[PDB]
Amino acid sequence: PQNTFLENIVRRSSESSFLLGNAQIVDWPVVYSNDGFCKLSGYHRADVMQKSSTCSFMYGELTDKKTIEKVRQTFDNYESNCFEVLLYKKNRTPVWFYMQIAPIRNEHEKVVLFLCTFKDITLFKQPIEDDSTKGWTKFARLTRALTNSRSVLQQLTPMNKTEVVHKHSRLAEVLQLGSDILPQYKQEAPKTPPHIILHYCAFKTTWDWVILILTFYTAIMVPYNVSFKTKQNNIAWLVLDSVVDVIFLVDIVLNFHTTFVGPGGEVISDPKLIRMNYLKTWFVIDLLSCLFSSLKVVRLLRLGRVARKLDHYLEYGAAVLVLLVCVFGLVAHWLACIWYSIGDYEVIDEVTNTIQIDSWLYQLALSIGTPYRYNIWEGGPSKDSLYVSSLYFTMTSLTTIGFGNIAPTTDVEKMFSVAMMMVGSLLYATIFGNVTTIFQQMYANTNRYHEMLNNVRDFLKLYQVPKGLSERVMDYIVSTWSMSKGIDTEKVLSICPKDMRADICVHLNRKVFNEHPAFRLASDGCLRALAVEFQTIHCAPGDLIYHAGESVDALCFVVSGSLEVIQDDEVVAILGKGDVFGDIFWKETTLAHACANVRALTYCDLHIIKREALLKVLDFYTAFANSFSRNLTLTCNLRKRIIFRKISDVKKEEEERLRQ
Amino acid sequence: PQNTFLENIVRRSSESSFLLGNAQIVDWPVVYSNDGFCKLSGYHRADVMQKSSTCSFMYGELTDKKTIEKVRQTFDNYESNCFEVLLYKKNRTPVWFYMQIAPIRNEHEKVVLFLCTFKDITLFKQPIEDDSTKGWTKFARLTRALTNSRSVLQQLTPMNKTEVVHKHSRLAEVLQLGSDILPQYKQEAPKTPPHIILHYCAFKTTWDWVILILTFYTAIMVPYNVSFKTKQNNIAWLVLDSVVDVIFLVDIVLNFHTTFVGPGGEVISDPKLIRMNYLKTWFVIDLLSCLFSSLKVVRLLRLGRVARKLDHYLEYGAAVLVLLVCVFGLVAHWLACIWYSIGDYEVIDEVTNTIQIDSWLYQLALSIGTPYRYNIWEGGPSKDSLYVSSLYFTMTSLTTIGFGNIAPTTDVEKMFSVAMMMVGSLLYATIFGNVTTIFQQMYANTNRYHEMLNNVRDFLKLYQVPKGLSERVMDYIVSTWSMSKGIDTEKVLSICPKDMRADICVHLNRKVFNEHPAFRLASDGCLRALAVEFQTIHCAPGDLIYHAGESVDALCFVVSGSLEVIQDDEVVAILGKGDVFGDIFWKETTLAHACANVRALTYCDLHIIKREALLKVLDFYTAFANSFSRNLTLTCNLRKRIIFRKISDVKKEEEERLRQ
Ligand SMILES: [K+]
Ligand SMILES: [K+]
Ligand SMILES: [K+]
Ligand SMILES: [K+]
Ligand SMILES: [K+]
């Protein structure tokens, strides 16, 4: 979903000098300048920007005031016209210009920009200049000013009294561009020329699936008709072939309207190139396949379409397995057809008029019960029995089972079965390799988890870590792999450079920004920085976050669970569900000693930010630092001690005081 | 094993304002405050904490002194009562409050906290105020003070003379909460509602195994009865089916009392949701299976339970192999049943009254010796021979052996055996893939070791490292892989963020803390820092730790073996089993030159700490730095030289002195 607007303007331009300027802002500042206006006026594309689009920076002394009034009025209310003005270049050279103001609409019909096309008509008019010494100086400059608009555009009548003709041509140009000057500045979808269908359309995929099914049907049925002679010839079967043939012809015609995917880029929608691409790639095979025994067997070339279209599916693992099973079936069928052809050729020698005992057809006739008769020769098995027998034999010989009811006994059958085995071994090996790769795909991840589990267990066993601490480590490993399922956040967030990382981190830390009053006067950039700098931790019951002597260097926000801050074996604070603790880092500049132990009661969830990152962020943004200081109050400051004296000690010391 | 105490209090609360305060500490400081007390008094949950739970910070001028005496007495000795007091909000607004003090017991019946529930009865009493100008000001505030306790709690009789009714309701509320106010603050185990059994209980796993065995039995026996017609019908077999059916009905009833595991969380024990979950997931299959040929064959739907329950076992590698072997056996049995059904249907055409020679049953009858008789038709093989023959054939066709005694010869048998082969190829490929994955699991680790071994050997051979140094490198590689078995401590310790790392490191370095007088006045935090900062090394006989010019930058503790410090080819120190050497880093601030070579005599073990980490730790903790300086004496200081003059030189120079 691009926003191709400059590309359309320059494609339509044919070497123009458009001067896109903003509309909603006062004075209509210039936003963009083509590198054709840098030569028509001498102003580079670094000072023309942010200047008024009324060309107030090129208005001089003898400029027409009334044209200034007209252009001011045209800019005032949104309308398009055409004017001829007399401006000055960077060298204070008087030059006549043609201006073609036109507004450009937004997505929902709003004026956003004002496109100002400029043309040069210096040689086409009389630019009277005062600082001249000879008459010829009034002529040569005309050739100097106009070079790409005289010998290129209007050179058929470059002689006098043609100025009115030039004005008429300019008027015709400006009148017949009603919709060409408004390309609808908007983020639109890709567009295609008429009578062109997208290769990824909803209709095209269904057409491709239909073509695949029909190609499979042809591959199944053509060898059967070639080998078993069919010879039924109904009217309910000769029309299906014709329907399939006309469908394939329709597909050949329709493939000329397909958007070829570019070499690493995106779709290409130029009919002058798609035709040539198809002709050079795959117009010979398609024509040959869709054109006697040879004419009817050449139709197996339709598998080229299946080979071409199966590229995205071949990436997967199960799709290759299904494809291999299908080709296994088709190969078995084709070998069955060849085997029956051999068996039919071998029986009944024609030089003599006897029947061969060697052929598998005669042995099959003995084993079924229907023998041959007559001596022309008639009898034998039915037409279904022959095909079922052939398929059964070629399936015994491809799966490496080989029962032995139907087996080669003639010289030709043996040297054909040798090739059958040579092909079948490779096919079977391919299937086995695909299956084992498919299994390894998932057992790789499972073994990756179990290897870490076993390594941790063996490390704990080796260094004789006492029971009660090994159990906690094992439970933590199991629990974290159950919760996260092996998905590491850092590896995923390393990808997607820092435009989606900030948004993802803001979403992850939404519970400490939405439900906390401190992060309420923060700009988007500051929130992005804080979100990418927090990181979060998960606790377990009994785990300690800070001990009695650790250095507090992180502000911790509690979003789930409950914490217990205990000092001198006495509970002094209970936290949970929206409490912040730690130390006041931004105004102390000294790491302190955690005065109390912070234990976890239930399964907690903390969003802790390190000291250095927080200080860096608060130093970069000044106003937010003041807001953060004013609006944040820690519910448990782990720097100062709470002074108290226990009741049991009071009662114990009272007795001693009474004694003395 | 959570400590859900606040959750129980807030669940029982029904929008109360409990004010949990400590008990063992004098004045009973407030520990936790609900975010319902921040509006009943205006005190935020940042200044109410660490204040006396006697509400001394809200006691005003006209507060009842006698109620103060009662609450002081109630806090003095551990007892629970209820009082009505007249307190002040943050805006000095007189407000009547109901206080419901109650102690909370520890695990072993000890008073720990004092829960003080508060209620507002402002509109329910007459709060006389002095700073008033009109009578109506005495009424509107009543609507302002009470909003969530008048229109929500008591709105059925909001008229005069109902104050006594309100007092009676309050007394009834306080009297009938004897056990609800004491949730036994304690780290307890998960609890379940009555008549609910844990899904991981010791009984549930046995029940699941029994159900698995019975499902396997049904899958084995139902097709046999369907296909071979059985027709024995004893009284010792019709009751086993009934017993299994009632057992499965009992299981269907009992599965309504199972704790479903939450989506990523832990068990869910709400009967109103487990029932709906079971009904939506798996109540149709279970009902259909446990309900003619169809009614007796639908029982194979019981395999859904096996499919569901086998999720944790499917992770392993050998369990999948056992499952695949079992399904191989069951598939062979089912194909045997189908094969016998086909063979029985084919023999003896019923249109005529003859016997078919094609069927495998007739060929089997010929090969055994028992033929068919009569022409109704009687004879043939026994009932055991038919089943053994069918199983043998379908096992020859699944293992890709295919002897050929029993093989398809009829049209139906061939087109059934084709499907048999199509299934068997995939099954056999699956088994092979599983086996090779299982082998690769362990050969991956073995090859990982051998690849490093070969790389080291080839690197030593390539750069022609002289013999006597390559041998030492190879011996070190072999010895360290024998001792550690490929278990890297750093990779294991990277996991388990810094709460178990400190404990593990303290345990690993226990031999330098317990058996050394220097680490005897160290707090837990300092020991944790030192333990996580040491790292340890293993030596070999002949290896040198420090040379004659290296920079000493580590304090080394010897815990096993013996060291030899030699200077000028003379032994000047022997160390071992509790000796510390190195340099005095904390008061020199200059890296020195090791004055002597420290060789290893036996297989040593050192716990060496780098200079930077030790200095950082000793700079963070001040008192421990003084204790460490006072209590540590190095047995071999590798900064100062020992001045000595050898005896052999004395004797040699004596002769020269006598000569001159
Ligand atoms: K075989
Ligand atoms: K294999
Ligand atoms: K094989
Ligand atoms: K065989
Ligand atoms: K045989």
Numbering used by the authors:
A (entry chain B), B (entry chain A): 11 to 301, 320 to 403, 408 to 692
What do the authors report?
The overall Cα atoms and the side chain of the two closed states are almost identical, while the differences are density peaks of the water molecule and potassium ion in S0, indicating that the water and potassium in S0 layer are dynamic in the closed states. For hEag2, in a closed state, the four pore-lining S6 helices form a bundle-crossing in the middle of the membrane right below the ion selectivity filter with two layers of hydroxyphenyl or phenyl residue, Y460s and F464s, forming the hydrophobic constriction sites through intrachain and interchain π–π interaction to prevent hydrated/dehydrated potassium ion flow. Below the hydrophobic constriction sites are hydrophilic constriction sites through intrachain and interchain electrostatic interaction of Q472s and T468s. The hydrophilic constriction sites together with the hydrophobic ones form a long channel gate. In the closed states and pre-open state 1, a strong and unambiguous density peak is located between the hydrophobic and hydrophilic constriction sites. The density is more likely to be a dehydrated potassium ion, and we name it site 6 or S6 as the seventh potassium ion selectivity site.
